[PDB]
Assembly symmetry: C4
Homo-oligomer: 296 residues x 4
């Protein structure tokens, strides 16, 4: 069941592809749940806490190094800074190698890489950004800072991966995943269509000014969504009536309707997916247990 050395039920269920109809519900059987919970507390609950603390420390060291950066390449302060930079690069390459090892070991069907285990892809992409930032730094360029800030943001965001192992916060993270995947996606598609259409209309209306550029008008229109719109950002054009009509149409369509609809849909989805989000967290904790077990 758990230690077969030929084929284990735990390995089959946990490492199953998304195709399996009930890869979550079948971990709730009495013996499996009892064994998983007992193992976690026994010798995987404090192995995970140590990993989480080490990652936190690594990220602190990475932030300190990057935040204090001086045509690269470029006292006690400098020795500490270079040591931190080297340690951060050494962590990035470690994550890259772990991701490649996971890619080879699991060898996905070239379909579940895009639908399953988003954590592995995110971590590998963070490592890839860090390595690109290193090569640019050693290749006489300044885009090494853009790559590094991208990697830093992604790494800080990735700390949610460790929210698993704490029940309530694990459920919260699973809910975040579901919401982003379904509701934010639908809303963003519709809202981007609306925003682009109205921004193009307004740009066509505008005759001459600083806001002829499609980017400028799109930014100004998006400014409404964040409660910072202007509604008078420009007055260099004819037919003010048409401009105000278009602006009011956009406001009513996007701010007064789509965002409130997003709130309502989020409420409904949260009301719907409590038990599924509990089962998904349980399975995410089972995969963590088995990965920790196999890492030796």
């Amino acid at each position: 069941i758990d230690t077969c050395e030929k084929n284990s039920v735990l390995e089959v269920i946990a490492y199953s592809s998304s195709e399996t109809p009930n890869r979550h519900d079948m971990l709730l059987v009495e013996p499996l749940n009892r064994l998983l919970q007992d193992k976690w507390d026994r010798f995987v609950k404090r192995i995970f806490y140590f990993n989480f603390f080490v990652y936190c420390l690594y990220m602190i060291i990475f932030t300190a190094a990057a935040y204090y950066r001086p045509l690269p390449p470029y006292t006690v302060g400098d020795y500490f800074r270079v040591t931190g930079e080297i340690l951060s690069v050494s962590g990035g390459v470690y994550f890259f190698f772990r991701g490649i090892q996971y890619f080879l070991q699991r060898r996905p069907s070239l379909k579940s890489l895009f639908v399953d285990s988003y954590s592995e892809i995110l971590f590998f992409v963070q490592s890839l950004f860090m390595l690109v930032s290193v090569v640019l730094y050693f290749s006489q360029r300044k885009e090494y800072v853009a790559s590094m800030v991208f990697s830093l943001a992604m790494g800080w965001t990735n700390m949610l991966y460790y929210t698993r192992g704490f029940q309530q916060m694990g459920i919260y993270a699973v809910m975040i995943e579901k919401m982003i995947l379904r509701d934010l996606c639908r809303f963003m598609f519709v809202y981007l269509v609306f925003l682009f259409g109205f921004s193009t209309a307004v740009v066509t209306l505008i005759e001459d000014g600083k806001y002829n550029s499609l980017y400028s008008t799109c930014l100004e229109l998006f400014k409404f969504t964040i409660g910072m719109g202007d509604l008078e950002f420009t007055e260099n054009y004819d037919f003010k009536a048409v401009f105000i009509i278009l602006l009011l149409a956009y406001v009513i369509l996007t701010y007064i309707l789509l965002l409130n609809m997003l709130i309502a849909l989020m409420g409904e989805t949260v009301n719907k997916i409590a038990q599924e989000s509990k089962n998904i967290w349980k399975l995410q904790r089972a995969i963590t247990i088995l990965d920790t077990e196999k890492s030796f």
Copy 2:
């Protein structure tokens, strides 16, 4: 059942009048739903994808009116003998042809259906909106030839209305189709009710505030109404004017307005839309199924 060429069950159900009690729920019968799904997957899916692809492409031939629109004034304009002006003119011709085609499609629908003149404005909003877009394009053309400067506004309206109309092509996918159906229900019911009440409240408080002040740039009704509306979008000032008297009265009026609209009616709208979401799931799925059925039957009749 499906095609007797005289009066088939699917044809009558799909073209049902609004007065029919449960026009939406008829398709749920197993043979009918299984027959629509099979026919779609068999030959209508690719046709619909092609139509959406060519439609969005056709609209995009004119969404670059920014780069197109000259600024010389008093059209018509001249031809520059450059590749750029060749692209501009061919795009304009392609945008006018599209408008004429959509106008005639609407006319062909209107005549063939021969509506009883009541369900026209109650159901089938998509084709009315497409016809309005065609009308706005034709008006742009006629104004353009007539040496007038209102063609820019007329094409801008058409452009915006077409970009929003892509929401029609949103159908054909269960998730986004049902999302569009929910948007339709919400904008018809909750937005209309809230808009009526909020517009009454805003007009009242705007007239009160305008009467309060004495003179300045905000003396007009329109300007003060705009300032009061700016509270709703999260940009309210609370001190937009100084040339007045009775600061107590002005402040208390602004507070009453804010508390009554921003902190009450918007949250009421959120709650009502939430309960509507909770209530119109299966209804919104059935309506999407009926929309797909109408599209399939129209494609069949398109030969």
Copy 3:
């Protein structure tokens, strides 16, 4: 129908429509078949148009009053002369009509109070519209009193009356099931959720504003009113977080502002939204029944008006 419609002593429909709020389940009384069918019949026969006629005349009155108010002269030291012009004639006759309407509303309110004879304990949840209209009428009358007393406070009173008149159009939402239900939802929410949230939020606002103004030393924002307004301005999504800099202990100022923001904007407003959602999910049936009872009260009052 004998002993149901009208007896000159007591009829069940009149009793139900005018029943005191203290009755346990006065709302469900209308649910029985004969009452529902008969009220629908009377409305569709006569009161449907009569109510629309009471919503057409009132709208005309309010438009006339607003037109008179907006075009008012600004010269000071009232009253003012009646110059020879069509505009002056029209505005003065509009003023006369508006004052007459105010007097009419004043008299109707007095008559209702004298006939119903309320206990002065049920004039908040009951006869809400009556109190609103009477207060509007009172504001108009005091406006006139100031006007002919040679005081400029008539402008303030008249603008208050105008605001109440325009916002009282919701009374006429009855006669349309969806609009009437929405209006009664507004009234219930105002009665419960707005009043609870406002009390808590006001306590928080006053506390933090007093703390901040105590911290400040001198300047424009040294007063309690200006600081209270600045703190309130966060709630409408236009906070500053840096509105003042003439003080000491920037850390304390930042801590207080962040604490206030987290406690109010992030917690209490989203809590109000959640409670409103729950209530709305809970108040459909009673909101329908209350609308039906309000409908019946309108029917009975129109019938008794003869």
Copy 4:
């Protein structure tokens, strides 16, 4: 009621009310018929009146304290010969007296109950909050006499804490009591989870941005953190600086932060609050009843 209300050694009321949180069903106990009839009898009999008097005197004390602190003049300060200065001094003396009184009441509670060092941070939030308010007041007094300006900061902290703590007296009013209990539950669960996630995201993106920014006003971590936080209150700027080498990266980072936090996390917080409110009605009523029982027992035991 023999050995239920008064026993001098142990009774059902004093055992249930003062039961540790380790007790499984501590809340549901008071719903038993005779207990519910006895608590409501004692309350109506006298505890309502004593509680109302205590609330009124506390409100008077807080008004005095606010007035004294508002008109504050290297302390200490002398006594100017004027009525205003005498009233200020007597008011601040009264405020200090109230502070020491609350301090000693908190000490008495600690000595009496003798909690197990774990219920302190999970039970009795009100008493610890009152004690912290008193501690701030005493620290303010000692600093004031020690010739420092830090007394102003201490006293403003105490004043704000007291004003927000005034909610303690909302109990004894059913609706406001349930409201306060629900506020307590929301702060413990939803605000905590959201704050954890939001702080993680905010620090990550703020660090990224401040790393991108070359130099200027916002080259410090605190300033950039403040600017990013401003987006949460509907006051983000999106153009607050231009001192960077890559505009595309800056705009992408800001858009990602906005989408992740403002659009997503805030709306999700609203939804989670709605779910919780739907979930915790009966549990919020039971907790209010238990709070009302504790208050009744305390008032009885105070004499």
